[PDB]
């Protein structure tokens, strides 16, 4: 009901709108999120300033597990309400969960494998990711409005 052809089975597989191109390799991924990078020149080469809000969103299941493990939340619903109110112990649980747990920082044109690096999150205020200065050469990132995507390794093997 248009001027354009209909899409068919061979079309459903082939073409960049096909399955192989951008549904078999390029997929949207959970436990992830992006923000706008800033300098943070005090960090070390192994850490990145993760905003408290992105960190509280990505690490949600880990935090729920912690609150129900330590007894701070009776069931997973109570923990959900705790971290929804953002109470005072969700922050201590964030510090504990994040402690040795890298985050992958990735910038859009991944020309090489240094456009992905694992950093240890350092919780910060605000909503900008703070990226080490000596890492911009690998990332090809200047601090005039570029953005970075953080992904969270989920398994021990990926950690």
């Amino acid at each position: 009901s248009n001027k354009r052809p209909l899409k068919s089975l061979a079309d459903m597989i082939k073409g960049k709108q096909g399955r192989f191109r951008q549904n078999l390799l390029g997929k949207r991924v959970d436990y992830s999120g992006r923000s706008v990078i800033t300098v943070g020149p005090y960090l070390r080469l192994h850490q990145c300033g993760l905003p408290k809000k992105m960190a509280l969103e990505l690490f949600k299941p880990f935090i729920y597990g912690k609150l129900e493990l330590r007894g701070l939340a009776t069931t997973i619903k109570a923990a959900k309400k705790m971290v929804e109110r953002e109470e005072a112990v969700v922050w201590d649980i964030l510090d504990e969960v994040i402690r040795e747990h890298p985050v992958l920082l990735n910038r859009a044109p991944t020309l090489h494998r240094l456009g992905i690096q694992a950093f240890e999150p350092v919780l910060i205020e605000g909503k900008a990711i703070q990226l080490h200065p000596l890492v911009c050469a690998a990332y090809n990132a200047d601090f005039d409005g570029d953005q970075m995507a953080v992904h969270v390794p989920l398994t021990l093997e990926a950690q």
């Binding site: 070390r44 192994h46 402690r99 040795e100 747990h101 021990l156 093997e157 950690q159």
Partner: protein
């Protein structure tokens, strides 16, 4: 833990090191075990890697301990 150079040197490979550390950290986290090294409030990942540093952990040791566990 910043650089894993010593853990890599003990095992002499960088993928096998990841695998050995991951299986020992799974023992130490879910299956339940005691760190052979004093954990300074570290996750099982860093504990496993530090253990591999001190020579306390590797694949030979881990399979030997599995044998001993069966003999339990």
């Amino acid at each position: 833990r910043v650089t894993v150079q010593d853990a890599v040197e003990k095992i002499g490979n960088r993928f096998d090191l990841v695998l050995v550390a991951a299986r020992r950290a799974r023992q130490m986290q879910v299956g339940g075990k005691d760190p052979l090294v004093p954990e300074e409030n570290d996750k099982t990942t860093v504990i496993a890697l530090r253990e591999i540093e001190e020579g306390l952990i590797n694949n030979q040791i881990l399979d030997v301990r599995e044998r001993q566990e069966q003999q339990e």
